[PDB]
């Protein structure tokens, strides 16, 4: 329901295919997945076969050989069907495969990427800890080197996919005297001796995805599991987040789109005072504001995705898309419930689920406050 300039036929086809999939495989089960906190095993597998779980990964590594513009469009359509399935997909793409593909060695790419491109295995990203999330550099989890292996100790918090993943990219302190400059990234298989999973979190939204802590107690891994060079941890997490934030913005657009779709359809069929709700000036103004917010957020998101594809700096653009999209999702999903009235408050309709799923997009992968700090830093830098 939005018009774009001249999108490549490859991307237009991709959009149609994902919309059909979401409409056929996700829409009818989204409610039950949310209610039962059930991981969409079968759906994720089918997605992998379509190559949706490794969109940016080249053909050589068994990837889809597409780009981030394609990734954003596909993620929106999927998230429109089920926000949980959308993040599960975003995590494997941007957060797991993303950093390995960019910083890993030929060998690491072959053993940690290839096995996670078809849906049989998915990864996760472990940066946050109980004592710190926004304050990323304050990593307390440590990694000691013991000759031909590293020994990890500490607790990681809020790990998405933790209960279904077969590997994780964890960030630990290897040199405390350098603080945020003494952090390193490590590839850890799951399960593995010394690694324990915390209890699943009971959350407001995206309840189909798992969220738990990762407890490391003298967990040993080979020395070669180090990703990049020692002390490169913070930079890797940051550049990885620049990519991931484009993914979360895309998930947000999908939730917002589903909300607008539901609101419009309901308003045209629901009568009040002898006519459809769409005859009320107020309802029109709302739908106008909702559409504007969404289409603006999509353009920002697409700009960021394209800058990444063209190999241009995109940290600020990524933060702007994530911020605008997430805030638009909550506002738009909020108005959808409003337009539905009483029907918007009950589980019979999906409006309340959209409201609950949207709320997380304003928090993870960097809260809105942090995105604003990031934007100001780059904005001022361009003025200096």
């Amino acid at each position: 329901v939005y018009q774009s300039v001249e999108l490549p036929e490859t991307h237009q086809m991709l959009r149609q295919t994902c919309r059909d999939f979401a409409e056929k495989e996700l829409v009818p089960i989204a409610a039950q997945l949310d209610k039962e906190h059930l991981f969409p095993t079968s759906q994720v597998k089918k997605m992998g076969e379509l190559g949706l779980l490794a969109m940016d990964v080249p053909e050589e590594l068994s990837g889809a050989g597409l780009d981030y513009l394609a990734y954003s469009i596909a993620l929106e359509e999927i998230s429109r069907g089920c926000a949980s399935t959308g993040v599960i997909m975003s995590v494997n793409n941007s957060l797991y495969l993303g950093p390995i593909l960019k910083f890993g060695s030929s060998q690491q790419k072959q053993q940690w990427i290839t096995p996670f491109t078809n849906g049989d295995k998915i990864g996760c990203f472990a940066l946050s800890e109980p004592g710190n999330g926004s304050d990323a550099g304050a990593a307390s989890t440590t990694a000691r080197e013991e000759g031909d292996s590293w020994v990890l100790n500490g607790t990681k918090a809020w790990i998405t996919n933790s209960w279904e993943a077969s590997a994780t990219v964890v960030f630990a302190s290897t040199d405390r005297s350098r603080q945020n400059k003494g952090i390193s990234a490590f590839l850890v298989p799951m399960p593995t001796p010394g690694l324990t999973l915390g209890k699943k979190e009971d959350k407001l939204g995206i309840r189909a995805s798992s969220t738990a802590n990762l407890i490391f107690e003298d967990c040993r891994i080979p020395k070669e599991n180090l990703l990049g060079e020692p002390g490169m941890g913070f930079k890797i997490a940051m550049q990885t987040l620049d990519m991931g934030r484009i993914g979360i913005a895309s998930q947000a657009l999908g939730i917002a789109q589903a909300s607008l779709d539901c609101a419009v359809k309901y308003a045209e069929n629901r009568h009040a005072f002898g006519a459809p709700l769409t005859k009320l000036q107020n309802i029109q103004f709302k739908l106008a504001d909702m559409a504007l917010a969404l289409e603006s957020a999509r353009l920002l998101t697409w700009r960021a995705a394209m800058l990444k594809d063209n190999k241009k700096p995109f940290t600020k653009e990524s933060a702007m898309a994530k911020l605008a999209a997430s805030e638009a999702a909550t506002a738009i999903s909020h108005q959808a419930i409003q337009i539905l009235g009483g029907m918007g408050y009950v589980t019979e309709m999906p409006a309340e689920r959209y409201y609950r799923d949207a709320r997380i997009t304003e928090i993870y992968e960097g809260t809105s406050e942090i995105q604003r700090l990031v934007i100001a830093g780059h904005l001022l830098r361009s003025y200096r």
Copy 2:
């Protein structure tokens, strides 16, 4: 807390009683009530014993003999402890006893008010129907006079307290062609022949309260169950809602206060980048805005209550309070989640429930759009 002008000792003292009650009886069980959708039977009875279920009712009729200012203050403290308990209380006070006290005959007051003041029995308000909520005058439920009896037929929708009430005030048309001028109000005992309850509605918030349809199939009630004059029903519904809206304004103030308390307490303990969150300027600004919106909405609410007590017009003032408070509750509870970050998205903290409960205040007893219409109508009337 907030600083008030100079409340009478009775009201200042009442505030303390209700806050201690909420703190001891509601706060510790609020999470369980929400999770189990459990009606707080023991607590409602206690509140009944305290005289909180019939505050504006004179002592002669077994009421507490207070006023709406006290009602507002008491309802805020209760709702801060549990939003469901608060609406259960507001319904009995404003929607059930209110209309009977104002338009009931001496005999109706003895029969229908007295047995509902101690917490053994409570009532409900049945105006809305599946096909109309905002458009209150389009009721399809009918009532025909069969000599010594009225016979009711139709379906009322969204009735709060429906599964626990012993009486209801229903609004039915006696001549559907006369539209909103053919509506009359009736008192119906529950249970009773010809009246069945719909299944409980599964909702986003205030889940400890029941919500369901009331189905009338040739339900016969004595001729004297007519409340007021025939065709006076719409007016009775409208004036009753003017009182009820001050009640919902008070409930919203409670959810908003509970939210602020949670945000402040957490903000002073949680550390980020070396210091408490309260040291961050942005955090300080959010708290300031949260405080302003809440104290501001409380003054509007108290104003409406006092006008009501002084027997002055208060329709516009009542709509302003309900509107400002309901929107503040959602904005403040939204920000409380943000300030807690990840912890605000999980059930371990109460913030997510506040967000859910707050959402309904912008919808029932007249949506925000309806409030705005009512406000605009009276405003214009003041200039002409």
Copy 3:
């Protein structure tokens, strides 16, 4: 201070050239133009020589032979230097030349377009009247046919460029029984017998441009001055406004950009509490919100400009850009004054002028309320 994907070198050069012009010719005199309500005669002429006054017009007609994407970029840079000069340019491009180029005959193009492409002569657009502006179809000005000429009678209101134009495209009723379907467009030379100019309006902003009524008293024009077919008036005004709204959105981006520029520069030099204002978290968040709003508005504007170039429908996109850009201009210019503090309230700085100039973008060429109606109409149509 914004990053775009891959802009054609032709447009990048065009941007640089206009920025230099604005910086050299407009920035240093903008204040005096605003204070004295002085039309920038010399500047407009230089602009014409650069071909800025006929950007969309093909080379054959003595135009610049560019497109609307080029037009938007050039208009932003110019408006950043002086909002008045920007609208004077927008009017000649989109409102005067625009409709003649699209609906005029080969002959009309030669005598009404060619002489208005170099800066010696500029046109104006007369649709609004004292009794109606938003309600466009309610044209009261009439045109009677007298064989080989038309006779115009009535008053046109708020005509920009009226005191400096040499021609105007006026809309008059030729058939009152068909109302908004009985309006026709006419080309009228200025001066001409029967046409009188009203007194110049004293306005809040864009004071360098002239605004006055056009009084027609038995004003006769040749029959061939009719533009398009009889009754085609409304459609021509509407399609013309779709183009013009892209121009006003562009002017808005320029005012917003100048506001952001001023705010950033001032905040980095002004100290408070021992450090630049840019060290205060609050100021950072503001600048972040201002940049986001502006870059979002620019993308919307560019999308609309490009759809017009590609010959695709753009009415909704045009309305969205105009709305978002104008509202962003007022918010951003408002925060610029705020960040400057006392300095933002005095004429020594340009911040207050930006605030005053921005306010008009929310009104002319369709108020924000009307843009919202337009958007909803198309949004719903796409859902039908």
Copy 4:
């Protein structure tokens, strides 16, 4: 109008007096005052005669003997007629007489208060300097005790009433190394040797009032001109501003009320699409929001006034009022222009002036950001 709880006859009566005064003496000349930057000499004297320039001053000292509630009410009515006249009045009341009445010796009260209560003479408040406004404790102006005299040196900036005042309360440091603990307050007569006025500042709004720098070059004043104890100056400045902010809150309420009155009156007369603007739902919604924000801010203002009168702490409550009212004045005056459409952008109507005057209320006597800081500080103090 608005419905109040139950004002004492004195205040209800005072409201009428001030409204009739504003209606007859200010409204008809407000446009000329703004346009000519003319200080309303005749009117200030009249207000002096009515006792409006020294409302909180006891009768023994020639004051009207009222309170801050009356002051607030009277100031709103005056500001509705002319925003400049209102600030001239607020300065004399809160910023000049306020500090002298609270910290002055018996003799200082007779010498500096009495001659300034009838409108023949008025005072000003000199705290800010070119290098600091928000950072009040960074004053560079110095005062050294030369035995029987103090000698002042420095520049105070932005002084309201500077060109018409006969006395000023200046804040100067006695030891710049002690920062905000080395500030003292002094009473300085005007004119006087060593004191020159800077040129009048040309500003966006409240143009009938004067604003200029005060330049001290070895200005000698008697030893007894010290207000309070040495080093007590910062505290005196802060407590004085707590009173002054209730004043600015009242002025903003006046500009906002004048704006609403203009919007309603115009909305009922202007026709569009067949009926009055008031028939359009969107117009009704704006008026409703405008009314809510204004009555809401008035209650906050009255609360602060009453606390002040009851000798209770009111710093936080005073900041909330000034903040909410100032922001409401800009939002409401902005919407008034929108509702008038084209007519709101020209000087023929007063809406554009309201917009201009409203803008300053968010800046002086402490910017909105400062108010928020003060609010957050006291809020947190209530929880600890």
